[PDB]
Amino acid sequence: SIPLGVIHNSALQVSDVDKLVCRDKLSSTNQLRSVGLNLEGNGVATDVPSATKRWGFRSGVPPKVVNYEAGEWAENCYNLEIKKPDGSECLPAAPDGIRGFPRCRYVHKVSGTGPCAGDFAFHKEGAFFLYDRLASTVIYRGTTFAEGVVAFLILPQAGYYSTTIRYQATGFGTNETEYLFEVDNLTYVQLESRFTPQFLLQLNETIYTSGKRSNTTGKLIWKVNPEIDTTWAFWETSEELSFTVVXXXXXXX
Amino acid sequence: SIPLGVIHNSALQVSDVDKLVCRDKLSSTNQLRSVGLNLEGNGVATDVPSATKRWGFRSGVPPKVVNYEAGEWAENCYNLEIKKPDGSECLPAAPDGIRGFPRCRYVHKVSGTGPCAGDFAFHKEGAFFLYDRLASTVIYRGTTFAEGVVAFLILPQAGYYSTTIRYQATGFGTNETEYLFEVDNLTYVQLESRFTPQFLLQLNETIYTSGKRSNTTGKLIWKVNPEIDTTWAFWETSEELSFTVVXXXXXXX
Amino acid sequence: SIPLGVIHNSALQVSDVDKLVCRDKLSSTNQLRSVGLNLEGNGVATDVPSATKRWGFRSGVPPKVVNYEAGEWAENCYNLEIKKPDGSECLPAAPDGIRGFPRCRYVHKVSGTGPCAGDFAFHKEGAFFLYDRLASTVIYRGTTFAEGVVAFLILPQAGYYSTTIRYQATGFGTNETEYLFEVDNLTYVQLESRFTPQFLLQLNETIYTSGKRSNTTGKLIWKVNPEIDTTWAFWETSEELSFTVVXXXXXXX
Amino acid sequence: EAIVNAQPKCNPNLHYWTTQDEGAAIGLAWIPYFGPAAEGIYIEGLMHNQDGLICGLRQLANETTQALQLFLRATTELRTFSILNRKAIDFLLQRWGGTCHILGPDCCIEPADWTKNITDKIDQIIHDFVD
Amino acid sequence: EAIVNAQPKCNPNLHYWTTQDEGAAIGLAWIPYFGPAAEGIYIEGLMHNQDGLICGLRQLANETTQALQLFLRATTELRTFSILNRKAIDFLLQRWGGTCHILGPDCCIEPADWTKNITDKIDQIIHDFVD
Amino acid sequence: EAIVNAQPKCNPNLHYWTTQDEGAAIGLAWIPYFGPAAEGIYIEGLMHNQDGLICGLRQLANETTQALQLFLRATTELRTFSILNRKAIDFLLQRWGGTCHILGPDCCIEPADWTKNITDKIDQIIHDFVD
């Protein structure tokens, strides 16, 4: 049975409607509320490599959607544009009335390719993909979502900035997935799990202002060597480097 | 809070479910009803020029639909087939299960072109477009609607003729909109706000029986000069004229 | 008013919620249930010729769907792929989330052609086409259904094998409909109403193991002569024959 | 609060159309295959302005619009069918969502006939106080 | 009103399939990614014709059809899921939609145990009438 | 049963967003044509971990998932909006779905003030036993 949150003795209890006592008063449907809470707030790793490993493709299971009325501002959201090698779309278009998650500090937009051995992409831990007040069991194409879960409550009677971070991916969904952070359409950085959003943005600004972008028709991929630090949860918390070149690979120290 | 109509002391009161007294008895969901009332019944101008100025295009606002169980016979309904100059449709196809308003004495079918600077056409005064027991915030293509509003009620315990009037329009939605009443595919009358439906139908019959239609491959546009009268609400209320010709314009007196 | 089933004095009564007495206790929505019962269980003929005569095409009536929570294992289900002579589809694709009936011993898959003089195919006796926990008034293309009806109840407080049988049809929906049972893509048997599913399967096995299939590029149609028996309801209940040939027709005795 | 019609005009008669969740069907007319098309499922009626209900209803629908539009803005349902059912629920929650204190103003329990069942049958004990 | 099965035949046994809104999942089986496909979510059972319930149920479903079809004709919902919830609401409105007159036939309030709480404790005052 | 947060971390503050079924609109802002776009309908707030409600809420949502996923597996509705309305109905059915036996544990009827309406006005008959 779907549990219900209720406040008793200055504490939140899990109860249900059939387990309340007569002193508990429900005088309006306004007292009943649904909330989406982000996995972020439980301490899960939010980097793109870690986050995408929590999702997988599966056939035979029809998608399901449930609404929720209130949500939590997210630091990390995700937006996927994945195709198969043959060019066909891996993810379905967002159904009518399903919009992106409304409050995202960083939108990790991942474009790329993978096998996608399944009709729909599900959350491997059973969580939901939270959109605009609608929670789905599956990922929709090009639609910003936060990973999260839904709670139901009985209440008692009585600026917004968003930054899009773009990635290229190969072998998406497998255990051999490669990620690149996109500086421009020809300059990229090899992505590692330890890179935080603010490190990527300052590494991006450094590459632009130090003039380390590609000045060729070809593709330039930087690698940040293990020397440099990057990383702790987001709610409780770069000037000059060296760049030399070595499909043109390179290294940054 | 959505208000509720209730009968008290031989009069309709606006109340709500949380404001009733114990003598008020609601013993069945059959006592709860929703009604669509037409703006017609409040005295608004119903001519095509006046009516279309109450609608406008807007992007960024998702359409919304609410059902209503009973409606009012309409004297004037509208049916729009508007395209952009490049030929693309301005209005979306009617969603599955949304049919035209069921009782219309006159269906003003307007075909034509306009800029349509917006994804959906809304009612500028916040009213609804009433279809078959479904009220929408937006206009659907080629689907007959009446302008109206919805009321919700708690009740106490205890021939159909329709005529389609066809119009051509240019600059639809702007303040420079031109309307023509269609007699046949090559004979038209310059439309003015004062022309009532019955005047248009009798002007149409006069043009047919006086043989004043175009006998050319070209387009013939009549103008009714300010001399002649036409017009008072619809619920409380032409033999021989002169026709001389002057894209072929002409005048009727 | 939609009737409600309730158990009283060791018997099922038709009642309603407004007709119960105070001793009748409804303490949970879990006590309210909907069931789909198959027409099979009432003794209707289930052969393809008899079953298809209960369905007909009709325009002007919008389809309607209602959910039901529990169903009955069916011995006979049906799956239709009917086109017009010009090749256009007679039946609409299954709407999103409408799957085939989940428990069918025999799925009679009928492919063929007919006039289909109507937008949707309805049940001539007012029954429903039961799908996966959704009952529809119309038939969907290539979607397995059982004919049945729905009941609503107030409860008191306190291996699966499926075989597909394939048919070809001409003049579907008329009173001049011809059916053929498909042995392979070139071997067929003229279908008669008396042929039970198990007779068709054993006639099929006999034709394969006696080597009576077509050994030509052409089409071979067997006819079972009135000599042989086949047929009583399904819940209360072939070795060697002669085959000689006579578009190649033939006879079996 | 009463309704004050403040519209430019009022059509005092309501020529209405609606359906019927029942209607004793004639023969086979309840069967979708045989029954009326979408255009033929309606019944009609005429209601006059007795007690001013029609002109009040037109004003009520007008004044309902803002709250209805704001409700529709906040919902993610594409088509809303649950307004009246939710108000039926809120009716019951308002009257029975808490403990019903008898004789209190928010408790719709009348002990009238059985105030007169005890005070009448006290004259079975004070009546028979004999030995 | 009782149910009279008037069908040509009756299958007296109900081999049924249904789902389960719960079911203590084994390990990860509740996760959609790991759980059963659409074909594997069903449970089965067999119910016999004790008290004639199965043959009565077949007749009940048969007789329900006209009212159900007429309801579906009148609704604009493409898929109807709210029939049973609305009947639950109409249950409560029938019993609690008005003032509950105690001891009346339409009021489901039993003052039994506490008819015996006053008439027992009248023997605390007529009991102690001593000075 | 109380909530034990067993997550690796807890963000003790809830920076939330939501809508508003009302909101006294300023002028014409309630009209869809003039009102905010989809991105501008939200209100924000900040809630802290007083009484441990935020960390308990995160654990509650976590533990709700299995029952919610199993419910979604069993339903044929593509989008579910009726969970909270059904729990409101089950609230009323649990308390008022049967006969309310006054003074019983499952009957939410308080005869307090009118236990004191009879036992006070017995001193109108035992009071006036004079001739």
Ligand SMILES: *[C@@H]1O[C@H](CO)[C@@H](O[C@@H]2O[C@H](CO)[C@@H](O[C@@H]3O[C@H](CO[C@H]4O[C@H](CO)[C@@H](O)[C@H](O)[C@@H]4O)[C@@H](O)[C@H](O[C@H]4O[C@H](CO)[C@@H](O)[C@H](O)[C@@H]4O)[C@@H]3O)[C@H](O)[C@H]2NC(C)=O)[C@H](O)[C@H]1NC(C)=O
């Ligand atoms: C509610 O909150 C709880 C607690 O936070 C969450 O519990 C998590 O549940 C998931 C399972 O769904 C757990 O994931 C599993 O972790 C196992 C261990 O992971 C590592 O653990 C340590 C390092 O942390 C190492 O010693 C170890 O070797 C692992 O490196 C993995 O073994 C599992 O992976 C295997 O099984 C899965 C299927 O489950 C396969 O997909 C993999 O390929 C692999 O074969 C799995 O990843 C997770 O650890 C739990 N967290 C905690 C803190 O206990 C719930 O998920 C949450 N509910 C919802 C709905 O969000």
Ligand SMILES: *[C@@H]1O[C@H](CO)[C@@H](O[C@@H]2O[C@H](CO)[C@@H](O[C@@H]3O[C@H](CO[C@H]4O[C@H](CO)[C@@H](O)[C@H](O)[C@@H]4O)[C@@H](O)[C@H](O[C@H]4O[C@H](CO)[C@@H](O)[C@H](O)[C@@H]4O)[C@@H]3O)[C@H](O)[C@H]2NC(C)=O)[C@H](O)[C@H]1NC(C)=O
């Ligand atoms: C419920 O019922 C009430 C009362 O009937 C309706 O009230 C109407 O509200 C609308 C606003 O939504 C009013 O429309 C506005 O009228 C202003 C005045 O119009 C003319 O008024 C007289 C002639 O009648 C002249 O003196 C004057 O110069 C105008 O010619 C206009 O100024 C407004 O137009 C301007 O603002 C709008 C946005 O509102 C822009 O689109 C325009 O481009 C322009 O800049 C506007 O048209 C209307 O007058 C009210 N009627 C009455 C009788 O008071 C409610 O609408 C109704 N509710 C629903 C939901 O139907």
Ligand SMILES: *[C@@H]1O[C@H](CO)[C@@H](O[C@@H]2O[C@H](CO)[C@@H](O[C@@H]3O[C@H](CO[C@H]4O[C@H](CO)[C@@H](O)[C@H](O)[C@@H]4O)[C@@H](O)[C@H](O[C@H]4O[C@H](CO)[C@@H](O)[C@H](O)[C@@H]4O)[C@@H]3O)[C@H](O)[C@H]2NC(C)=O)[C@H](O)[C@H]1NC(C)=O
């Ligand atoms: C609930 O349960 C009852 C009882 O089982 C079902 O009742 C059936 O109702 C249908 C009508 O919908 C009946 O069908 C009609 O049967 C007539 C007689 O059929 C034959 O009867 C005997 C042989 O059995 C012969 O003497 C006779 O000549 C017929 O051969 C037919 O005349 C009807 O066909 C004509 O009308 C229909 C429209 O109804 C046209 O489509 C045809 O072209 C033709 O002109 C019709 O077929 C059926 O007989 C009833 N059965 C019983 C046992 O009484 C309900 O249907 C059921 N409800 C639901 C929803 O399932």
Ligand SMILES: CN[C@H]1CC[C@@H](c2ccc(Cl)c(Cl)c2)c2ccccc21
């Ligand atoms: C048959 N009932 C019709 C007629 C009157 C009309 C009606 C009913 C009650 C009132 Cl007080 C008013 Cl003003 C108008 C109505 C409203 C909603 C649904 C149905 C109906």
Ligand SMILES: CN[C@H]1CC[C@@H](c2ccc(Cl)c(Cl)c2)c2ccccc21
């Ligand atoms: C597990 N419950 C099943 C079995 C019986 C079956 C059932 C239940 C009660 C009755 Cl009186 C009948 Cl005749 C048949 C049913 C009906 C609806 C939903 C579920 C179920």
Ligand SMILES: CN[C@H]1CC[C@@H](c2ccc(Cl)c(Cl)c2)c2ccccc21
């Ligand atoms: C304005 N109300 C917001 C703020 C708090 C937030 C909330 C409300 C009550 C509690 Cl007990 C908690 Cl932990 C959190 C909430 C939840 C659902 C819907 C709306 C809201």
Ligand SMILES: *[C@@H]1O[C@H](CO)[C@@H](O)[C@H](O)[C@H]1NC(C)=O
């Ligand atoms: C991971 O990929 C490796 C290739 O290095 C391969 O051996 C194996 O198929 C994968 N293992 C798992 C557990 O997925």
Ligand SMILES: *[C@@H]1O[C@H](CO)[C@@H](O)[C@H](O)[C@H]1NC(C)=O
């Ligand atoms: C970068 O590439 C994307 C995708 O090919 C394209 O849409 C975009 O216009 C490009 N931007 C620039 C600045 O070249």
Ligand SMILES: *[C@@H]1O[C@H](CO)[C@@H](O)[C@H](O)[C@H]1NC(C)=O
């Ligand atoms: C990277 O830096 C450039 C330089 O200002 C900026 O235009 C661009 O938006 C930055 N990229 C991201 C993802 O912030």
Ligand SMILES: *[C@@H]1O[C@H](CO)[C@@H](O)[C@H](O)[C@H]1NC(C)=O
């Ligand atoms: C040309 O490109 C290199 C990267 O390949 C960059 O580091 C360098 O600064 C560019 N040239 C100049 C003059 O900036």
Ligand SMILES: *[C@@H]1O[C@H](CO)[C@@H](O)[C@H](O)[C@H]1NC(C)=O
């Ligand atoms: C109306 O159109 C005129 C052109 O005559 C133009 O000046 C102006 O843009 C429009 N005015 C308004 C108020 O829309």
Ligand SMILES: *[C@@H]1O[C@H](CO)[C@@H](O)[C@H](O)[C@H]1NC(C)=O
């Ligand atoms: C008039 O024009 C319309 C649209 O071009 C066309 O569909 C219709 O057939 C025409 N009618 C006649 C009588 O020419």
Ligand SMILES: *[C@@H]1O[C@H](CO)[C@@H](O)[C@H](O)[C@H]1NC(C)=O
């Ligand atoms: C105009 O008159 C002709 C002549 O009878 C008629 O056929 C036509 O329908 C009329 N048009 C309208 C819109 O009534």
Ligand SMILES: *[C@@H]1O[C@H](CO)[C@@H](O)[C@H](O)[C@H]1NC(C)=O
């Ligand atoms: C030819 O057309 C004119 C309109 O241009 C019409 O008035 C006239 O009657 C027509 N000719 C005849 C002989 O009717």
Ligand SMILES: *[C@@H]1O[C@H](CO)[C@@H](O)[C@H](O)[C@H]1NC(C)=O
């Ligand atoms: C049946 O088809 C026959 C052809 O043999 C034809 O006479 C008639 O149109 C049909 N009869 C009925 C009752 O449908």
Ligand SMILES: *[C@@H]1O[C@H](CO)[C@@H](O)[C@H](O)[C@H]1NC(C)=O
């Ligand atoms: C039989 O025909 C069907 C339809 O033409 C085709 O899909 C199938 O592959 C064929 N099978 C064989 C064994 O030829």
